């Protein structure tokens, strides 16, 4: 298996959303990932893995898990705190048989604390630490940014950083440890810019009235003539001016970029402008500009866009497209992810592993 | 310095947004990070750093950068492809003097390809790979999820994973290499769940009409009596039912949870329920159940919420709260971050570095 984590050995305890997304990216990058289910998947998330089944409630699955864990560099689990403990696969149990194990725990609320036993999804984890409040248009109730922010950006990504850091540390302590990845915490450091910004008046708790939430007329989407959108990211004044040029608007007849008092008149001017031609027109107007003007593409249009084609951001599998691994390494490059293959006997893996 | 990356040595080439966010987290986690500016910061994002000054244009600063890079494990650069090359800090130059260097490049569009020389921000990178399309209410044009998805979740976080993986690979090749972290790619892998789901009919390019984008009445926000919001994440039927009981609704007078045909009647019923009382009323009602119902808190209200208090998700600094490091390590724990620090003579750092 190619890529930089070639050699690393990961055990994943099948659960939902963040945990597998982390196991996946490890896989993507060359790790040898082994996922334990209950007794083919056409879920792609389960690519770059071997799947085994066991019954960790029974004496005999318990025993085979530990055999796997003992040979493994990493364990991922994403259940309620106390659950691996009571199966007897806790951190203190795994330590007895392998004290070099990086024991990664993936939760919303964390290992400890009042909420640490309650159910929740992404929307609740980001409800509590400010993030969801800030997302959306001001005249309307907050909008969920999918599960991009807590599950992944603020969950699996921080689990991955926790695992790969703890692996750096082991390479001179020679021990592992437990990583407590809680989404409420990880998403907070994800949005730390806003927290910094709030302290110098460069961000406000008021919704829809900031520089990056769509309060700013030069940082938002515009509906075009044909009902589709373009995205404007022109913060820098030189970028903004190349944008005004493509639209063919005169700086003199416009409010200045940052006269917030007149941001409504500026937006109406930009709106009228962009609605006067279809999306694709603006693509051609602004091809090779610093205008920071791009088409808003629907998922099903993505594989036709040049820049996506030329860099193989995607590959074709099953129904349609998945993302190729990221990021990319110059010397030990990742290769095309392997599809989820049918089950494997758990014994044969111990034997693969010796 | 405390935390798991204690030992690691990072040179950051000052720029905007993703690259600093990466250097920050490294810092958070114990690395010794050293940032090179042009000629005290009030910005917290610059915590866990030492700041130094050089004119990389002149033979004087070029030469001092290389001395630092030569002693360093990681270099972070966030400029246009071709820019470090022309300064004479390209990858092949650094290799001359340090072939163990992890050379991490942080861009929107990537190192290569048609758009790789154009300006952009977060909103442009997520316009192109379907992400931005999918965010928002369907009767309104896509809404930006701040810069949470391209700059951080799909930017800095994948630079971090690239750096820490390349470090693992070095620990047996004994060479480093270049990581090409592009937001367009990183965010795609971030939203891999949707890509997978599209291919089994569990996701639609139609906007605001899915399970995690606010189309589901049981995964969305609701306005309360007092104008404020709660978040409902009640996907699992047992969660959903604990939610109906908290609101005091008869399960049997409601349309089935997944009779999408009557999702408008379900939502009206829930809307009516939740508007009948203030937010904080619900916050109490649901403070323990597995109803996956939580208050939507403004950033300014976060530090008062129990779960946040007990876990020290935040600390105070500069007349306001910032996020404590994440994730958390049981044996080599991170410390409270050090604030930015005034500038330092670059020679004194060379010296400190043996």
Numbering used by the authors:
A (entry chain B), B (entry chain A): 1 to 39, 45 to 359
Lines quoted from the article behind this entry:
Crystals of the three MCR mutants H126A, D156A and E241A were obtained using identical conditions to those used with the wild-type enzyme and diffracted to 2.45, 1.64 and 1.85 Å resolutions, respectively. The three mutants collectively had fewer hydrogen bond interactions; within the H126A, D156A and E241A mutants, 3, 5 and 5 interactions were observed, respectively. The active site of the H126A mutant underwent the most profound structural change due to the loss of the imidazole ring, although D156 and its hydrogen bond interactions remained unaffected. The E241 side-chain which is hydrogen-bonded to H126 within the wild-type, is rotated by around 90° and projects away from the active site due to loss of its binding partner (H126). Interestingly, the normalized temperature factor (B-value, 45.79 Å2) of this E241 side-chain is lower than expected due to the peripheral Q243 (39.70 Å2) residue hydrogen bonding to it. As the E241 residue is stabilized by Q243, it moves away from D156, and hence, it cannot substitute the central structural role of the imidazole ring of H126. Consequently, five H126-mediated hydrogen bond interactions are lost. The observed displacement of E241 also suggests that it is unlikely to substitute the catalytic function of H126, which implies that the residual enzymatic activity observed in the H126A mutant is facilitated solely by the D156 side-chain. Wild-type MCR was the most efficient enzyme with a kcat/Km of 1.07 × 106 M−1.s−1, while the H126A mutant was the least efficient at 0.11 × 106 M−1.s−1. This near 10-fold decrease in catalytic efficiency for the H126A mutant relative to wild-type MCR contrasts with the near abolition of activity previously observed, but shows that although all three mutants had diminished activity, the H126A mutation was most detrimental.
α-Methylacyl-CoA racemase in M. tuberculosis (MCR) has an essential role in fatty acid metabolism and cholesterol utilization, contributing to the bacterium’s survival and persistence. It catalyses the racemization of α-methyl-branched fatty acyl-CoAs, converting the (2S)-epimer to a near racemic mixture of the (2R)- and (2S)-epimers. The enzyme enables the conversion of α-methyl-branched fatty acids derived from cholesterol metabolism into forms that can be utilized by M. tuberculosis for growth and persistence within the host, a key component of M. tuberculosis pathogenesis. Within each active site, the large domain contributes the catalytic residues H126 (part of α-helix 3) and D156 (part of α-helix 5), while the small domain contributes a third catalytic residue, E241 (part of α-helix 9).
